[PDB]
Enzyme design. Structure first.
Site, PDB file in Angstrom:
ATOM      1  N   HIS A  16       0.736  -1.260   0.000  1.00 43.03           N
ATOM      2  CA  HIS A  16       0.000   0.000   0.000  1.00 43.03           C
ATOM      3  C   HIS A  16       0.759   1.300   0.000  1.00 43.03           C
ATOM      4  O   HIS A  16       0.147   2.356  -0.119  1.00 43.03           O
ATOM      5  CB  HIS A  16      -0.978   0.001   1.193  1.00 43.03           C
ATOM      6  N   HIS A 130      -2.731  -3.424   8.324  1.00 43.33           N
ATOM      7  CA  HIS A 130      -3.810  -3.724   7.381  1.00 43.33           C
ATOM      8  C   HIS A 130      -4.518  -2.447   6.955  1.00 43.33           C
ATOM      9  O   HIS A 130      -4.736  -1.553   7.772  1.00 43.33           O
ATOM     10  CB  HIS A 130      -4.873  -4.639   8.008  1.00 43.33           C
TER      11      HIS A 130
END
Length: 135
Positions: A16, A130
């Site tokens: 990410h 996450h």
């Protein structure tokens, strides 16, 4: 599913934060080659790892993804991001998968946890593990 050589924070950074190319098809090859499959969708946050660690310092909130978890934090402000969506699945030769890309500016909610004692650097005791959701 993450490769064994990565801690959750390192995998979070790989998936990410470190977009190796401004093109989703090229950027996704890294993630897909590590996971050994073509991810259907993936969001790259155009921000720094340090900025995300700071978001871990915001108030704890329920994770919209796992209503049983309370280790999520809201970004507070919008950040630019690129969402990659698989347009051409290729389960026999993953290097041929193709993606569409969608630029946007949104808030994000991240789950954080204590660092991996043995493998994560001491510099950041709390790390993002996450990407729970973008809103």
């Amino acid at each position: 599913m993450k490769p064994p050589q990565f801690t959750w924070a390192q995998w979070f950074e790989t998936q990410h934060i470190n977009m190796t190319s401004q093109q989703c098809t090229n950027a996704m090859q890294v993630i897909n080659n590590y996971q050994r499959r073509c991810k259907n969708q993936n969001t790259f946050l155009l921000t720094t790892f340090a900025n995300v660690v700071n978001v871990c310092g915001n108030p704890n909130m329920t994770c919209p993804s796992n209503k049983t978890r309370k280790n999520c934090h809201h970004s507070g402000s919008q950040v630019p991001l690129i969402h990659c969506n698989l347009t051409t699945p290729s389960p026999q030769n993953i290097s041929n998968c193709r993606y569409a890309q969608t630029p946007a500016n949104m808030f994000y909610i991240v789950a954080c946890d204590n660092r991996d004692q043995r493998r994560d650097p001491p510099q950041y005791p709390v790390v993002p593990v996450h990407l729970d959701r973008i809103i």
